[PDB]
Amino acid sequence: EHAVIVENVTKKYKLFKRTSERLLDMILPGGYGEDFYALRNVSFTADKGDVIGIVGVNGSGKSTLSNIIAGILPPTSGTIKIDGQASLIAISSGLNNQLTGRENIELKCLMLGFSKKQIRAMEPDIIEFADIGKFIDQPVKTYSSGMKSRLGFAISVNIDPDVLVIDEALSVGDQTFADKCLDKMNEFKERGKTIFFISHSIGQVKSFCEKALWLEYGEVRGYGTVAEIIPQYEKFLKEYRAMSDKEKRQYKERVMRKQQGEFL
Amino acid sequence: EHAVIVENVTKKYKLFKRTSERLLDMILPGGYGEDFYALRNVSFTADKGDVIGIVGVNGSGKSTLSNIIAGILPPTSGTIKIDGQASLIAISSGLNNQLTGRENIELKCLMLGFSKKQIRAMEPDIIEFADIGKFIDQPVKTYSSGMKSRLGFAISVNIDPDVLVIDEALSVGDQTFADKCLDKMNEFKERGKTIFFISHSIGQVKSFCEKALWLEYGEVRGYGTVAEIIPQYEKFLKEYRAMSDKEKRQYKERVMRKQQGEFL
Amino acid sequence: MRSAVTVLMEHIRNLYLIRRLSLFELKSDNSNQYLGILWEIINPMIQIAIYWFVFGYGIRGRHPVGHIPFILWMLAGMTVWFFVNQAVLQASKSVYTRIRMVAQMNFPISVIPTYVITAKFYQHLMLLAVIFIIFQFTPYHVSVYLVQLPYYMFGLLALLVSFSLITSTLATVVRDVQMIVQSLVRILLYLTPLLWDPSHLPHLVQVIMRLNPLYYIVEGYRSALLGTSWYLVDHASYTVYFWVVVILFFVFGSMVHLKFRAHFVDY
Amino acid sequence: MRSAVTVLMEHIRNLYLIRRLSLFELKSDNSNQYLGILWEIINPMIQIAIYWFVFGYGIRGRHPVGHIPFILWMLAGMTVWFFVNQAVLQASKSVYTRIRMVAQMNFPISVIPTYVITAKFYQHLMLLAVIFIIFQFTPYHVSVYLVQLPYYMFGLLALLVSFSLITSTLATVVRDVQMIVQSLVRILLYLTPLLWDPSHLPHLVQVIMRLNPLYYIVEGYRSALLGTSWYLVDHASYTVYFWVVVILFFVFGSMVHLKFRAHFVDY
C-alpha cells in the first residue's frame, strides 16, 4: 500500500585512510576512522505509481538508493516496507564464463527461482529472442562483448516481480535489437507495475518516465513529476557547465559548501 | 607509410561442440571439431588518414579486427605492418580493486611504460582531471560504477601513441564530464594521428569520423568516406527492421545465405 | 530456541536446486579448462604412494595385527582425507567470492556452501569407485556380506554440510578463520590417525583422541574390510557422541547464520 | 643460438618496474583484506611445530652428530620450503589469470612471473628476519664470523626466477603441468631431506639424491650455524653442478618462451 514506506533513510560506509580494520585497535572493538555519510534523511512515497526516474551526478552513487529498495543492503537508520520486490536487473552478472548457452539459462533461471517444468516452458522463447543460433552450444568465453549483453538481457527479463529497478542501460543490445528491447519494456509500462529507472540520458528519461526524483549527495533536492524538475535540473547543469563562476573560485567553494553539506 | 599494410586477413577460432581439446584424440595431435571463420580476406589501406569508423552488427564481433591492428592477436593468414602502434584503450581494465587512487595511477602508468620521473610530472594533472578529491586516498572497491570509469579514462589517455583504437564509448564519464572528455579527444583529431573508432551510435560517428568501413560477418561490404555508406548502412537497417519480408520466411533464409557466406 | 528449522526447510525446498547446479562447478573446474580430464584420481594416486613410501618404510614390519593390514590399511583410510583437505577449504571461501553475483538474485544463501561440498562428493564416486578394483585382489573377493557403509558415508555429508556454516558465515565477517582453517585442516592429518596405529598409548590419551569426530568415520571405512556387521554396539558409548556433535554444530551454525544473514554485503 | 640475451635485457630495462609493482600484490593480498596482518609468520610457526611434534618424536635421541642439532637443525632448513610451496604454485598460475589485463598494455610479459616471486621474497625478510631472535639463544650468540649467506640467498632467487618460465609459459599452452607441479611441489619435501639425516645409506643412492639442486641451498642455510667459512671447496665437485642447472633452465626457459610469446591469447 502506497508502494514504499521510505522514511528518513541514512546510510554510511566510513572512511579508512590506512589499511583495514584493527589497524590500530585493542580488545575494545572501536576503531579510529573518519566518518562519511552517503544518504541523509530520505523519505518519499510512490502511491502505486507507474515509474520514477532518478537523475543527478554520480558523485552521489545513485545505486545505493536503488538496491536499498531492492532489499539487499541494510540501511543504518530508517524503515522501508514494500512487497515481494525484485532483485533489480541481473544484466551481465551471474553468467559463468565456462558454460554454454543452454547451461547458463539453467543457471540464472534457477538463481532467480523457477521450477523444473517452468524452465522447459520458458526455454525455446529465449533462444528465439536472443538470435545467436549456432553459438548457443558454445561457452560464453567465445562470445563477443555484444552477445553476452544480448544473452544476459534475455534471461533476466521474464521475472514477473512486483517492483522493478533498472540500471543505466534500458536497451543494451545492438541496433535492430533495441527495437525488440524497448517493445519488451513497454509491457511493464502496460502492466502497470512500479519501475525505478536510473540514467544520465535526459532524452530517454523524458520519453519513458512519469515521476522523477533528483538526488544530490544524499539530499533529495525536489521531487515532482517531470515537467519542472528536469528543466530545473537542466538549469543546474547549464549553470554548472558554462563557467559556474570560475570552477576554482566557486566550485572548489561549492564542494566545500557541500562538504559542509555532510553535516549541519 | 600508408599507415596499414592490411592484406587478405583471415582469422578462425573453431567450434568445439563438446568439452575441451583431446576430447577424443590420440597421440596424433589432430582434433575433430567444426570449422568456423571470423574474418575472411580483408585488405585495405589507411594512407595516413585521420579517422576511420567501424559499424555493422556485433554478430561480426568487430573487436577482432580492432585488436589485430593493435597487434595482440595473431592472424591466421595475412600480414599487417604499421608502426609503433597503441595498445588500444585501457578503459576499466587493469585497475586492481584493492589499491587506492594514488596507487592505481602508478599501476597503469607503469603498465603502459613511463619512467619514474615521468609519473611525477604526469601526476597532479590526473587528479585535477578526475575530480574525485577526497576519494583519491581510498581503494577502488569503495567507488561507484561511474567513478571507476571516471578514473580509468584519466590515466589511459596520456599515451602519445601512433595509432589509436577506441571501443564503443568515446565519452564514458558523466554529464558535465563528457564535455571535458570530447574536448580531450579533439586533441588527437587536431594532432592528426590515426584513430579507429567503433560504435553503434550513428549520430556520434557522423559527428566524429571522416572515413568509415562497414563489416558484415568478416566480409568488408564497401568502404568509402561517410557520405554514401552510412545512409546505405541505414538503408540496410530500415530494410531489415521494417519487416525484412517475414523474419522467419526470409531472415532465417538470410542467415542461411550468410552461413553459406562462411564459404564458397 | 529453534531457528535451525528455518535453515533445514530451505534445503527441502531446493533439493533439485542443490543437485542441478552441483555438477556445474564440477563441469566448470574439472572440465572445460584443459586437455584429458579427471586428474582427481590421477593426482591422489600419485599423492598416496608418496605417503606410503616414507611411512611404510618405518613400519616395514609392525603392521596392524590382522593378517591383511598394510597399504591395505592405509588407502582404505585415505579416501576420507581427500574429501577434507580440498573440501573444507573451498567450502569456506565459497562466500568470499560470488556474493556480488548471488545477492542480486532471490534464493536462500544458506544453500550456497552446501552444493560445492556435494560437488566434491562426486570425487568419492570416482575415487572410492576405483578402490574396489584394487579390493578385488584381496584374499576376500569383495566381502559382499559386509560392505554396508551408506550410513558411514552419510556421516561425511552430515558433518561437512554442518561444519561449513561456522566456517562460511563467520568466514565473511572476519576473513581470518580462513587463515585458521588453512592450518586447522593441516593439523587434522596427525591429530587423527590416518597413518599409524594409536595403540602405543594407555587408555587416557588414546581414548582422549577420538573426541575428534573424524576418527569415527575412518573406523567406518577401515571396517569396509573387517566383517563387523554390527559396528554400533561395540562402540555405542561414543557413536551417540558423533550424532550429538553434528547436531551441536548444526544448531550453532544456524544461530550464527541468521544473526548475520542480511549483513554480509560490505565484506 | 642465444635468444636468452633478449629475455635478460628486459629485466635490466625494468628493474624499477620489477620492484615498484612487486610489493603491490604484497599490499593486495597480505593487507587490505582482513584484520591484524602478517599471518605469514603466525601461520608457518604453527605449521613448523606440527612437523616437529611427529618427527622429533621418532628422533627423540639420534639427532645429527653435532652437539646442537635438534629443532635447531630443522627450522634452519624449513625457511627454504616456505618459499617453495607457495611460490612455485602461484608463480605458475600467474599467467593463467591476468593476461586479459596485461596483453592490452605494452610491456614485456617475461617479467610477469618474476615479480610475484619477489613479492614472495619479502616473506623471508620477515620470517628469516625472525630466526635470529631465536638464534640469539644458541650457545653462540650470533656467530658473526660466519653468517655469510647472500650468495646462498641469491641461489633461491636465481633458481626460482629461472624455473618459473618452464612452468609459466608452458603452463598456459596445456593447463596440465599446473596439476603436475601441484604434486611435484609435494614430492619435494621428501625427495630432499628437510626432515631426516640422509646418512642411512651408502654412497650411491645417497650421492644420487643431491641431483635435486634444492638440497644444495638447504646445505647453505644449515651452514648458517656451522662455521665452514669456505663452503665451496669441500663440495666444489657439484656446486658447479648447481650453476649449470640454473643456466640450463634459463636457456631452455627462454627458448620455450619466445617460440610461444605471441600466441597465448586463446588460452
Author numbering:
A (entry chain A), B (entry chain B): 2 to 265
C (entry chain D), D (entry chain C): 1 to 267
Describing publication, verbatim:
The wall teichoic acid (WTA) is a major cell wall component of Gram-positive bacteria, such as methicillin-resistant Staphylococcus aureus (MRSA), a common cause of fatal clinical infections in humans. Thus, the indispensable ABC transporter TarGH, which flips WTA from cytoplasm to extracellular space, becomes a promising target of anti-MRSA drugs. In S. aureus, ABC transporter TarGH is indispensable for the transmembrane flipping of WTA precursor, an N-acetylglucosamine (GlcNAc)-modified ribitol-phosphate (RboP) polymer covalently linked to the UND-PP moiety, out of the cell membrane.
Using the cryo-electron microscopy (cryo-EM) technique, we solved the structure of A. herbarius TarGH at an overall resolution of 3.9 Å, with the catalytic residue Glu169 mutated to Gln. In the absence of ATP, TarGH adopts an inward-open conformation. The distance between the hydroxyl groups of Ser64 on Walker A from one NBD and Ser146 on the signature motif from the other is about 6 Å, suggesting a resting state of TarGH ready for ATP binding. Similar to other type II ABC exporters, the TMDs of TarGH consist of 6 + 6 transmembrane helices (TMs) without domain swapping. Using the program Caver 3.0.1 (25), with the probe radius set to 1.1 Å, we simulated two back-to-back L-shaped substrate tunnels, each of which has a horizontal entrance along the membrane-cytosol interface and a vertical path through the cell membrane. The turn is surrounded by a line of positively charged residues, Lys93, Arg98, Arg100, Lys120, Arg175, and Arg186, whereas the transmembrane path is mainly composed of hydrophobic residues, such as Tyr51, Phe55, Trp81, Phe82, Val84, Leu89, Leu189, Tyr190, and Trp196. Scanning along the vertical path, we found a constrained bottleneck at the tunnel exit toward the extracellular space, which is guarded by Tyr51, Phe55, and Tyr190 from each TMD. Remarkably, four of these residues, Phe55, Trp73, Phe82, and Tyr190, on each TMD form a hydrophobic pocket, which is occupied by the loop between TM5 and EH1 that harbors another Targocil-resistant residue, Leu195. The ATP-free TarGH adopts a resting state, with the substrate tunnel closed at the exit and open at the entrance (state 1), as shown in our cryo-EM structure. At this state, the latch loop blocks the exit and functions as an autoinhibitor that mimics the exogenous inhibitor Targocil, while the entrance formed by the GL and LoopTM4-TM5 is open and ready for substrate recognition and binding.
